[PDB]
From Swiss-Prot, chains A, B, C:
Its EC number is 3.4.21.107. Essential protein that may act as a regulatory protease that is conditionally activated upon appropriate environmental triggers. It catalyses: Acts on substrates that are at least partially unfolded. The cleavage site P1 residue is normally between a pair of hydrophobic residues, such as Val-|-Val. It comes from Mycobacterium tuberculosis (strain ATCC 25618 / H37Rv). Keywords: Cell inner membrane, Cell membrane, Hydrolase, Membrane, Protease, Serine protease, Transmembrane, Transmembrane helix. It is an enzyme of class 3 (hydrolase). It is found in: Cell inner membrane. One of its GO terms (cellular component) is plasma membrane. This is Probable serine protease HtrA1. The periplasmic region consists of a protease domain (PD) and a PDZ domain, connected by a ten-residue linker. Interactions between the PDZ domain and the catalytic domain lead to an inactive conformation.
Length: 296, 296, 296
């Protein structure tokens, strides 16, 4: 008579792996999920960040459920979503995870934050979804720039032991990727989009406006702190100490939501930015650039 | 096929509101619960504390489930129980919460700490009741005096995102009011009593003895640290460095339980205080005063 | 209609007790579990540590569910497993706990961390098993030496309010002993072995090698930091800055697992220690001594 969560955790264990990167004097471990039978594995960008930035000195391996250790190669990574894709070569009989639909997730849904069973300090935690589409700032691990993501929030503990592993619903389906870098997960629908671009192109392109903001709240939004020269914001009329309240069709509550809303804009297409300037309600038009132009 | 907690959270969402108070350079947000069809809303005293103390510069609104924003007026507040009552005027088709009975709550009962779905960093957390009638100290927000309450304790996370919202049982009934100011909730039976007095009178009166205590434990209770001149304690013979072990019919383990026990006394009626004085077991009689005499 | 966890917590409440040790100017409280009808109670070593080290000034009592207070005497204690056994004399109609089998516990199993209902800040928390056989360091309370144990890890909160109490499965059976000294419990199968030796002999004997280690991880294990003179390690050839990777038949990931693995060796019997010495893979033979020779 195995328990409710015991069954679900056991049903996905074969699909979760330990990811380990080591040099002469450093060792760095995480979890990941098998998402493609050819050997493609999804994890956090901060789990592999140092191996990616120092690939000549770091070696990355994958440890499966049975204990097999296999070399692993970095397909691509996205620090802006704290996502990354690895690939193991010609491994047979892989248990691929079942990818859910994070758009159907609801507050109160019971979830499991599953870490790799063989990880050093591995954890499997249980809780509910506490919030949806919740912008959360994430600290960049190495030279990686900090970022903000629309996260699924859960009161299941997200820690080093299950970071990079899957957030699992009661149907044993992946609805998110745990990120410890009061718990947060990268929703699986964004995960599928980012991993598709990383698998095909080895990188991903996100829109940018050249804006840096700080949060403001009074009788509220993202206050423009710096506008880059020649940027879409500078060419659109966005001024400094403007208070951004809407980017595209998304209302902006603070600096966190501003970062997320910008990534939802269309590159190369006009878009409205609603601001409040010295008390006045002003709307501006910006054409977002790609953040990496030679990959666009 | 919606989940166990998903159903309960969704069934009470229409009854939980976002409470927001703003000035020229300040913004303060919380949650509340609709408890009366005329428009009466219960929240924490620390959610509104600054608007109450600076009403000329702060404006308070209520945001409902559908997104409606409505002005809100402070009916009354009790810092000693960290409770407060707001009122929205002539709002139709209000979903009033179902108030449970906190005296029937038991350790192990599954609960939800529900925050306002539209709050900025809103949360809905899940856990069990971890303790009943647990005295807990609460820090006063502004110039508000600190206090202690008989709390329902839960291992559901109580945070800024669900503070002021309801603690909900598996029957979708309110058994407490969350207070973040390891989680604690104001039991609903005390909530009904305090809100009734605040709705009728705009304030509430609690008994007082003129005693300040610190906790002591050895081969134990509340040690009298200061007795106000002319107080019921001073007129009853209570001395300094007395160790209070019983107030009324309630045993007193420490300073926290002493504060709570005093509030359970009858105003204007004799009551026994059992103390241990230089090793001796002494009982004293005190007649508690109202803490605000012109409202009694 | 009592809840799922409400029933289980209520079914074991009569078997959990408050343990309290007091002097002239100190007071120290914990929880324990009744494991034998003659009056034998199991708790943490850090709950009673100061009464054990200063028995002339500390007095220890047990408070049952109904409220009975009874003197308690220390049978034995093991700081290396943070376990201890008390005994109440000639108490009738004791509700003895049902001891489960921690070897059958699985990740995801629903558990309750039950504290003594009458304890000052007692808690009952709920969660799942997050990891099995997880080495965790524990800080010694008084002059007690720090230690490491193979723990059951749970995301049920382990705190002062339930430390020393039982970790309870959904069959109301004890699978571990809570230790607060992200939660950890002493598995019940080790608990039965340690308590048997403490009840019979008033103490327990654990193997030792004379090794102190620090953790290392690179392209990994316990690095030998100090070898005692004349120790089994010194007589076996173990050198300083050796990197221990296997003790007996147990792989050793870090210093935590090394401590635990040593306690699983046979006293007086040869055993292999696999090390990596200046790049070379070397195996050594050691004969573990008893840590207390006159009790062996």
């Amino acid at each position: 008579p195995a328990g409710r969560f015991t069954k679900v955790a056991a049903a996905v264990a074969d699909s979760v792996v330990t990811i380990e990167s080591v040099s002469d004097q450093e060792g760095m471990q995480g979890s990941g999920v098998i998402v493609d039978g050819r050997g493609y594995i999804v994890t956090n960008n901060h789990v592999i960040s140092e191996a990616a930035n120092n690939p000549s000195q770091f070696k990355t391996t994958v440890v499966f459920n049975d204990g097999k250790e296999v070399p692993a190669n970095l397909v691509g990574r996205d620090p802006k979503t704290d996502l990354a894709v690895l690939k193991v070569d010609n491994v047979d009989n892989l248990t691929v995870a079942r990818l859910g639909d994070s758009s159907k997730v609801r507050v109160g849904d019971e979830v499991l934050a599953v870490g790799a069973p063989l990880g050093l300090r591995s954890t499997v935690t249980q809780g509910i979804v506490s919030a949806l589409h919740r912008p959360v700032p994430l600290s960049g691990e190495g030279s990686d720039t900090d970022t903000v993501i629309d996260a699924i929030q859960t009161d299941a503990s997200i820690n080093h032991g299950n970071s990079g592993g899957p957030l699992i619903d009661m149907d044993a389906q992946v609805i998110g990727i745990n990120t410890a870098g009061l718990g947060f997960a990268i929703p699986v629908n964004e995960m599928k989009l980012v991993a598709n671009s990383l698998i095909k192109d080895g990188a991903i392109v996100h829109p940018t406006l050249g804006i840096s903001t700080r949060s403001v709240s009074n009788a509220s939004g993202a206050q423009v702190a710096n506008v880059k020269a020649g940027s879409p914001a500078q060419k659109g009329g966005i001024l400094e100490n403007d208070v951004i309240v809407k980017v595209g069709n998304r209302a902006v509550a603070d600096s966190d939501e501003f970062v997320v809303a910008v990534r939802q804009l269309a590159i190369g297409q006009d878009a409205p930015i609603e601001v409040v300037r010295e008390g006045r309600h002003v709307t501006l038009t910006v054409k977002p650039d790609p953040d990496s132009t030679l990959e666009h």
